[PDB]
Amino acid sequence: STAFRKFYERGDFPIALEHDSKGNKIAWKVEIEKLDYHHYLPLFFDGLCEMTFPYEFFARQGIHDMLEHGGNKILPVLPQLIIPIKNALNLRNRQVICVTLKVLQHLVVSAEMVGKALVPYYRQILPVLNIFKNNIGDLIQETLEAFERYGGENAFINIKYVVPTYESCL
Amino acid sequence: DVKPKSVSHAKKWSEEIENLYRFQQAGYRDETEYRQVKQVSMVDRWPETGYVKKLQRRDNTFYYYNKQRECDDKEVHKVKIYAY
Ligand SMILES: [Cl-]
């Protein structure tokens, strides 16, 4: 939020603040594989709250590229992402929720064991979804099924504990 | 409950190795174990180099580290590199 905006204007923001006429790709000043994800990834997740142009564009594109190319750099940082995820979701803004759920789907397929590691944090991040359970209702179901799919044997029941109405036939 | 699976020994000194050195001197595998054990906002680092500046140990004493490289080429081999 304010944290991300400060980040955005600093020389150490790793993305070049420029637009190419060819398309909407972001240009990295610094190679992604060279970033300490312990520092940078939570800063980008702070941007989930962002709804203002151009902050939200760089937050979203940045998260996406770092998740896509993070490899084994992502899982070690998972605990640091939970509070920014929770904070975004608990705003109870549908647009922010829809971006955050798509991000979460990317997160749990981004690397091995990440879906499994998310399970102990279900109770921190799922509760607001009950308000918007059934468009956002379908996105929620879809997201919960991703969590189950890549979350190991203990995933269904922990989803169900937090989201009592959850059902699934994978 | 996030913990590495495989372990290798470092080959050539690098920035990454320097920092692993500093964590392990203080009794931590890496920044992930450090943040598990202690409640950490950010890690104190040297602005110019990004090197770890200070760490709190498990007995609550503190280790401080120099602005420039500390890992002697001799010591490089002893730095453990953890998997995931
Ligand atoms: Cl994404």
From Swiss-Prot, chain A:
Q: Which GO terms describe its cellular component?
A: axonemal B tubule inner sheath; axonemal microtubule; cell body; cytosol; glial cell projection; manchette; neuron projection; nucleus
Q: Where is the signal peptide?
A: none
State which tissues express it. Expressed in all immune tissues, spleen, lymph nodes, thymus, tonsils, leukocyte and bone marrow. Expressed also in heart, brain, skeletal muscle, kidney, lung and pancreas. Expressed in primary Schwann cells and very weakly by monocyte-derived macrophages the primary host cells of Mycobacterium leprae, the causative agent of leprosy. Component of Lewy bodies, intraneuronal inclusions found in the brain of Parkinson disease patients.
Keywords on record: Cell projection, Cilium, Cytoplasm, Cytoskeleton, Flagellum
Where in or outside the cell it occurs: the entry states:
Cytoplasm, Cytoskeleton, Cilium axoneme; Cytoplasm, Cytoskeleton, Flagellum axoneme
The GO biological-process annotations, alphabetized, read as:
cellular response to unfolded protein; flagellated sperm motility; protein localization; spermatid development
What is the additional note?
A: Linked to PRKN in a head-to-head arrangement on opposite DNA strands and share a common 5'-flanking promoter region.
What is the designated name of this protein? Parkin coregulated gene protein
Curated annotation (Swiss-Prot), chain B:
Gene Ontology biological-process entries: manchette assembly; protein localization; sperm axoneme assembly
Q: Which family does it belong to?
A: Belongs to the MEIG1 family.
Residues folding into a coiled coil are none
Q: What keywords tag this UniProt record?
A: Differentiation, Spermatogenesis
Q: Which domain of life is it from?
A: Eukaryota
What's the stated role of this polypeptide? Essential for spermiogenesis.
Could you tell me which species this protein originates from? Homo sapiens (Human)
Put simply, this protein is called: Meiosis expressed gene 1 protein homolog
Matches recorded under InterPro entries: Meiosis-expressed_gene_1 (IPR020186)
Any matching Pfam family? Meiosis_expr
Self-association state and partner proteins as the record states: Interacts with PACRG. Interacts with MORN3.
Starting at the broadest rank, the lineage of the source organism is:
Eukaryota, Metazoa, Chordata, Craniata, Vertebrata
Of the GO CC terms on this record, one is:
manchette
| Gene (UniProt) | MEIG1
